[model samples]
Target: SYKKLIHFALEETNTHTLLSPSPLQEKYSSLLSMDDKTELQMLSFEAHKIRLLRSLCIEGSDGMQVLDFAAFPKPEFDLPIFCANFFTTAKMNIIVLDLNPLHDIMDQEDYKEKYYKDLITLGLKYSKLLPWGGKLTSESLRFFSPIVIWTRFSSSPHNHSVLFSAFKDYYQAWLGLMDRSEGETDASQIACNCEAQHRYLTWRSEKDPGHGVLKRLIGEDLAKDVITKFLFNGVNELGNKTFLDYFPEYRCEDGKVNEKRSMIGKSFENRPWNARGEFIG
Candidate 1:
């Protein structure tokens, strides 16, 4: 069950500090879906390094379960974000789990070498089992890393077991990176980290395909609040930049953010990265 993952994350975080619960829990602890048969469970916490560690789990009566878990580092640290989003139903599962780079790894050699160089082996270990999911939104490639596990699988207990193992390995790997990460003392570098993360939050809150499912389950108004205020919380607090400021391609002539999910459309039928962790796309 997805609850096991949530428990493991909380237990792991507890090893580092006395976890402080976020105020968001009070307002969003449990909510009934539009069907009234499904309930959404939300949890949040913060530690010394974590800015906002939050998760959302929905178990529907139709044997559908969704889990969106993420850990955002405080702006002072340039560590990659820990993201694991899984959508499961009776038939199939869609997953994208990664230690998402905070900066553009394609252009920034040092950043890739610093965080992901050694983790390529770990990625290879699971990528063989999970494989590539197929074409995804081209815009999403910028947010993903060479080591990302973007895959899909038919529902099976064995597959779920393997996925749990991958999740544990990746989460532990992220914690190890956090243990070694040095906080940026330079004010300019801190600002850069802040803006980069804000842009990511802005992008996901607006363009995540999972939002459509959330809207159908919870309705539009609640879905928007959940995405903006809870799922991607720092979009407002981290910076004053708008989505258009970061992604000018999505701007419309009428000054509204373009509703299209992707300007370049979907791509990369095969995994875009080589086994050596080089981007081929």
Candidate 2:
């Protein structure tokens, strides 16, 4: 079936980019903020503005030599270092999902098995690496369709923020729910840190997310502790195990043609998002 594509055409956005790149020192050269600088140096990409920056990093790499051409001017900035950094980050969560409409090679059962096995291997590998297991988020929910749930965390040339309310209503809602539960869950602090970090990194040069509010809402102790603790959580582990189980493989240690791929299919009931807005999976 031809899945219905979302046909959303919004009015021209009057709002401007929070973190627009500029050569002016008063504009984009202000140390990239704390979190933005960190993400720039560490994650090497904007988390809130993940999609746009990532695309720029990719497409710009092949054409112009700028760090992110549009984001960073070439021949002037540390284009090589910045671009190299983003390239590596881009490789971490990139993926390739090829749909063979003709299935020309399907006649060869072995080839078919190998293809599926490759996908399974890639899936398991990604489960252990990329943040969130590359799960469909509220922000990414619009891209999925019924025919396929194409996703990836491969090493290929492929794959931002808002206010506290935007983060809270959409991103941190679950954090709040978790906090209400027992055992001093770090949800509130995590929410605070994530929101502040995102806003600081992605905010248009004009927007000012109040510092006093951030400090008050999430105290220093809780803020630091929550972000640190969140890293040790085993959500990432469970996802990897699940992928391995779903794609069970046989070990012929010698690497003959004995590897087999699992044919079992699981219900999508455990997935987070519905097939569409105002709908349930």
TM-scores for every predicted model: 0.98, 0.20
Q: Give residue 115's error in model 1 in angstroms.
A: 0.6
Candidate lDDT (C-alpha), each: 0.92, 0.23
Model 2 vs. true fold: TM: 0.20
Give the per-residue lDDT of model 2 (tens digit) for 1-281.
00000000000111212333222222222122223322111111121221112111112222211121111111111110011111223333222111111111223444234223323343333323333223332322221211122333334332211111121231122122222323323666444433322222221111111222223434555333222222111223212332223222322467432223212222333333222211244
- Cα lDDT tens digits for candidate 1, 185-267: 99999999999999999999999989999999899999999999999999889989888988999998899898899989999
RMSD in Å for candidate 2, one decimal?
Answer: 20.4
TM-score quality measure for candidate 1: 0.98
Error of 1 at 81 (Å): 0.4
lDDT of 2 at 204: 15
Can you tell me which runs of candidate 2 are displaced by over 4 Å?
Answer: 1-168, 184-281
Best by TM-score: 1
Q: Which window of ten consecutive residues has the lowest lDDT sum in model 2? A: 1-10
